[PDB]
Design a protein around this ligand. Structure first.
Ligand SMILES: Cc1cccc(Nc2ccccc2)c1
Length: 120
C-alpha cells in the first residue's frame, strides 16, 4: 500500500474519497463480503473491455492487500484510486505491479459510476 497515496486519501477531499468509494462498492456489486476479490476486480475490468486472469488481478489487489485476504476493501481501493489518477512515477523509479491490465481511474470509475460519473 503506497503510503504516499495512503496519505493522498488523507489528502483527498470528502467528495474525492466519496466518489471513489462508489466504484469500490459497485466493483463489489452483489459481493458477499463486499470487498473486491480478484474476479470482483475482473468484473469491472471486463466491464471496461479488459479480460484479466485472477493472477494479474491478484497483483492489483495484493498492493493494498494488507490483511493478505486477497480482497480490497474501501481504503485499499481508494489509495489505488488516488494512485491511479496521480501515478507520477512516469519516467523514474517505481516497482512493477503487473503491466498486464491497467485500469484507468476514471475509465474504471465510470463503469461503476453510472450515477455520478464525469461521463457514462
Ligand atoms: C497495478 C495495480 C496496483 C494496485 C491496484 C490496481 N488496481 C486495482 C483497481 C481496483 C481494485 C483493485 C486494484 C492495479
Amino acid at each position: 500500500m503506497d503510503d504516499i497515496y495512503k496519505a493522498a486519501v488523507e489528502q483527498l477531499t470528502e467528495e474525492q474519497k466519496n466518489e471513489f468509494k462508489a466504484a469500490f462498492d459497485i466493483f463489489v456489486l452483489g459481493a458477499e463480503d463486499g470487498s473486491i476479490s480478484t474476479k470482483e476486480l475482473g468484473k469491472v475490468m471486463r466491464m471496461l473491455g479488459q479480460n484479466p486472469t485472477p493472477e494479474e488481478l491478484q497483483e492489483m489487489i495484493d498492493e493494498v492487500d494488507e490483511d493478505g485476504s486477497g480482497t480490497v476493501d474501501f481504503d485499499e481501493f481508494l489509495v489505488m484510486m488516488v494512485r491511479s489518477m496521480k501515478d507520477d512515477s512516469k519516467g523514474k523509479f517505481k516497482r512493477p505491479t503487473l503491466r498486464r491490465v491497467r485500469i484507468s481511474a476514471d475509465a474504471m470509475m465510470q463503469a461503476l459510476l453510472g450515477a455520478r460519473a464525469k461521463g457514462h
